[PDB]
């Protein structure tokens, strides 16, 4: 068994993944500087850990083109990593916050007619809670749209919104690998944006309903290793997003669950 790991920097995540991969067989640590295609790679599977989402997406697709399977797959990285594509996949199968998508500023201005205020505006490709906005009225909506308009990225012209959900000072982050629930935490914060990346604090979550809902949410995609974000609302549990390049250092610390081991064990299952 020969296992590649692609990375940008060696985070705690990647060191743990390397150790666990080394228990199964030979490990090949592939910095982005070592990624050049077409090329000759002798690998049974590649575990994709690039920090940039888009770099993760393309490096998965490139290894696939060399006949090397990838965890996660390029398909999953794109489908789960885009908030709009991901909620469209989720909406069949699990409860999600009410949402709206518009293709222009003029259409976006009609979103409050469906969702009401307050609502949340967020980019389709973001992570770590960046560019999230709680919009309480029309003036705020107009300000967000004006700023999105003047940014370079044409992806900011896909306007994705959700109802603002009143959470009890926290949200939930769940881990499902290969269809198996591996663990969950609460992320607490004094701010409505609860990411550990922005100072959210982890507590272990043993709620059996989040386990059940998380597996179902994973099943909407049917492959891979996903971090799942769930909100507690007055209507019950809602699946918000799914993340295909999971961070877990805090979750693992807080829960005692071996996210790195489960990831690797799933990758070698996928290899053979």
């Amino acid at each position: 068994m020969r296992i590649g790991i692609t990375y940008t920097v060696l985070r705690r995540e990647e060191m743990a993944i390397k150790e666990r991969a080394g228990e199964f067989g030979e490990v090949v640590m592939l910095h982005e500087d070592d990624l050049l295609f077409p090329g000759n790679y002798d690998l049974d599977v590649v575990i994709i850990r690039n920090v940039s989402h888009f770099k993760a997406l393309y490096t998965a697709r490139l290894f696939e083109s060399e006949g090397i399977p990838t965890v996660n797959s390029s398909r999953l990285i794109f489908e789960a990593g885009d908030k709009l594509f991901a909620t469209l996949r989720l909406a069949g199968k699990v409860p999600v916050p009410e949402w709206k998508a518009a293709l222009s500023e003029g259409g976006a201005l009609r979103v409050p007619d469906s969702l009401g205020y307050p609502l949340v505006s967020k980019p389709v490709f973001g992570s770590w809670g960046r560019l999230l906005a709680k919009v309480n009225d029309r003036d705020s909506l107009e300000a967000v749209l004006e700023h999105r308009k003047w940014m370079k990225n044409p992806l900011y012209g896909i306007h994705y919104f959700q109802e603002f959900v009143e959470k009890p000072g926290r949200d939930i982050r769940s881990y499902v690998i290969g269809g198996e629930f591996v663990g969950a935490i609460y992320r607490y914060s004094n701010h409505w944006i609860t990411n550990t990346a922005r100072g959210g604090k982890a507590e272990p979550c043993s709620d059996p309903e989040v386990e059940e809902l998380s597996v179902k949410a994973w099943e909407a995609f049917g492959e891979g290793a996903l971090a799942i974000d769930i909100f507690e609302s007055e209507k019950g549990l809602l699946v918000n997003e799914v993340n295909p390049n999971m961070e877990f250092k805090n979750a693992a610390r807080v829960t005692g669950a071996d996210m790195a081991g489960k990831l690797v064990e799933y990758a070698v299952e996928v290899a053979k």
Partner: peptide, 30 residues
């Protein structure tokens, strides 16, 4: 190892020198 982040980023081995992590981009994360 040649890119460990430590409490920032190890840029070099032969002469071991630390350096600040790069600019956070708009697609960085999970």
């Amino acid at each position: 190892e040649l890119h460990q982040i430590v409490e920032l980023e190890v840029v070099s081995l032969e002469p071991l020198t630390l350096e600040e992590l790069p600019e956070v981009e708009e697609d960085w994360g999970e």
